[PDB]
């Protein structure tokens, strides 16, 4: 009847990646703290986006407050080291970033961002649209920079682009002096920066302080004001895939994201702010609102703090269809793990330092 149902969290608060989990715990604050009568007990860790103590925190998540869930983290690489542990000792992960999923992972691990396809056919069409024929690329060294650079060649070669450089840099990275003078040499009629957070804003800048005159793209990872903070002027007319949460009053009413989109913003926007929302901050949000649903559909076959929850639980994101969210309307099945399709994504530039939809 009333005994708790336990979620553990990690995500990064400290470090290079803070500027995404800060929202994403922040969020908790506006999260039911019950669902049918069973009260959760949050459990939330900070990783530093590091992957061993991601990796840490979830073991003991699992061994020690005998999680239901967990959850996390902002980053790929602590989000990959999550979905291991998770798949190992057998407990249902919602992860807060893309992350490469792989047989390993498959079973236990659902996707609350957009994977990254849907976001890169966006940005490429509007390529297209836009008469861009050569596109560059910097992006981290790393799974996330990865999974764009590949996703660019195949989707955006399969278009008609042309890729005339690639450059890599550390998320720790200050400086990406050598890398913006090699892509500004080449001359694209378009950069895609493969980053996010703080680091997504390292290019911004360096690539306009260098003379780069073309059109720059971002991910989905920079969807926050931190963005526009960071990069001032050189932000002005970027291309940036979102989720739908940076504008939910711009939605039909139809919309099934309208209503827990507008939710969460004023909720969030009236502690932090006007125009704190952040992809990030729906994220997290998004991930109660999957367990909203799942949830009593668990409860009926077993009891919380049982292993048979956590089988319930897995089982009931194959069965709960249209989990409607801030950021998209969810249908996972046993082979795709992020569950979204075109309603999940918009496209943001930016105009006098305001993020605009574009049409
Ligand atoms: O930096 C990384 O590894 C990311 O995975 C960033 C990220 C986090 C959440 C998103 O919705 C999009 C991108």
Same mark, same amino acid.
């Given at each position: 009847?009333?005994?708790?149902?336990?979620?553990?969290?990690?995500?990064? !608060?400290?470090?290079?990646?803070?500027?995404?989990?800060? @929202?994403?715990?922040?969020? /908790?604050?506006?999260?039911?703290?019950?669902?049918?009568?069973? @009260?959760?007990?949050?459990?939330?860790?900070? #990783?530093?986006?590091?992957?061993?103590?991601?990796?840490?925190?979830?073991?003991? &998540?699992?061994?020690?407050?005998?999680?239901?869930?967990?959850?996390?983290?902002?980053?790929?690489?602590?989000?990959?080291?999550?979905?291991?542990?998770?798949?190992?000792?057998?407990? @249902?992960?919602?992860?807060?970033?893309? +992350?490469?999923?792989?047989?390993?992972?498959?079973?236990?691990?659902?996707? %609350?961002?957009? @994977?990254?396809?849907?976001?890169?056919?966006?940005? $490429?069409?509007? %390529?297209?649209?836009?008469?861009?024929?050569?596109?560059? =690329?910097?992006?981290?060294?790393?799974? $996330?920079?990865? /999974?764009?650079?590949?996703?660019?060649?195949?989707?955006? *070669?399969? %278009?008609?682009?042309?890729?005339?450089?690639? *450059?890599?840099?550390?998320?720790?990275? !200050?400086?990406?002096?050598?890398?913006? +003078?090699? /892509?500004?040499?080449?001359?694209?009629?378009?950069?895609?920066?493969?980053?996010?957070?703080?680091?997504?804003?390292?290019?911004? !800048?360096? +690539?306009?302080?260098?003379? =780069?005159?073309? +059109?720059? =793209?971002?991910?989905?990872?920079?969807?926050?004001?931190?963005?526009?903070?960071?990069?001032?002027?050189?932000?002005?007319?970027?291309?940036?895939?979102?989720?739908?949460? %940076? #504008?939910?009053?711009?939605?039909?009413?139809?919309?099934? !994201?309208?209503?827990?989109?507008?939710?969460?913003?004023?909720? $969030?926007?009236?502690? =932090?702010?006007?125009?704190?929302?952040?992809? &990030?901050?729906?994220?997290? $949000? #998004?991930?109660?609102?999957?367990?909203?649903?799942?949830?009593?559909?668990? /409860?009926?076959?077993?009891?919380?703090?049982?292993?048979?929850?956590?089988?319930?639980?897995?089982?009931?994101?194959?069965?709960?269809?249209?989990?409607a969210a801030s950021q998209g309307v969810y249908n996972f099945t046993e082979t795709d793990r992020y569950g979204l399709?075109?309603?999940?994504?918009?496209?943001?530039?930016?105009?006098?330092?305001?993020?605009?939809?574009?049409?």
């Amino acid at each position: 009847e009333t005994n708790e149902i336990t979620v553990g969290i990690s995500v990064t !608060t400290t470090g290079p990646a803070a500027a995404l989990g800060i @929202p994403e715990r922040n969020a /908790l604050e506006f999260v039911v703290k019950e669902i049918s009568g069973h @009260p959760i007990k949050i459990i939330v860790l900070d #990783d530093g986006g590091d992957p061993t103590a991601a990796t840490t925190n979830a073991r003991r &998540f699992v061994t020690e407050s005998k999680a239901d869930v967990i959850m996390g983290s902002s980053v790929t690489p602590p989000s990959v080291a999550i979905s291991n542990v998770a798949n190992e000792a057998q407990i @249902p992960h919602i992860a807060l970033a893309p +992350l490469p999923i792989t047989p390993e992972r498959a079973k236990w691990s659902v996707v %609350m961002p957009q @994977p990254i396809p849907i976001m890169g056919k966006v940005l $490429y069409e509007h %390529m297209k649209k836009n008469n861009v024929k050569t596109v560059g =690329y910097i992006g981290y060294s790393d799974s $996330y920079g990865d /999974l764009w650079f590949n996703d660019l060649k195949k989707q955006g *070669e399969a %278009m008609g682009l042309k890729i005339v450089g690639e *450059e890599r840099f550390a998320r720790p990275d !200050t400086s990406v002096a050598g890398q913006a +003078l090699k /892509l500004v040499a080449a001359n694209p009629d378009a950069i895609l920066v493969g980053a996010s957070g703080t680091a997504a804003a390292l290019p911004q !800048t360096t +690539l306009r302080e260098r003379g =780069y005159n073309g +059109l720059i =793209y971002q991910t989905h990872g920079a969807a926050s004001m931190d963005f526009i903070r960071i990069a001032g002027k050189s932000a002005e007319g970027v291309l940036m895939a979102s989720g739908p949460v %940076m #504008d939910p009053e711009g939605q039909d009413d139809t919309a099934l !994201t309208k209503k827990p989109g507008m939710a969460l913003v004023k909720v $969030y926007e009236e502690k =932090y702010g006007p125009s704190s929302r952040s992809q &990030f901050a729906g994220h997290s $949000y #998004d991930a109660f609102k999957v367990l909203e649903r799942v949830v009593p559909v668990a /409860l009926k076959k077993a009891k919380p703090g049982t292993q048979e929850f956590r089988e319930a639980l897995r089982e009931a994101f194959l069965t709960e269809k249209d989990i409607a969210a801030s950021q998209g309307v969810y249908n996972f099945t046993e082979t795709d793990r992020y569950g979204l399709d075109d309603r999940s994504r918009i496209l943001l530039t930016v105009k006098n330092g305001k993020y605009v939809i574009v049409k």
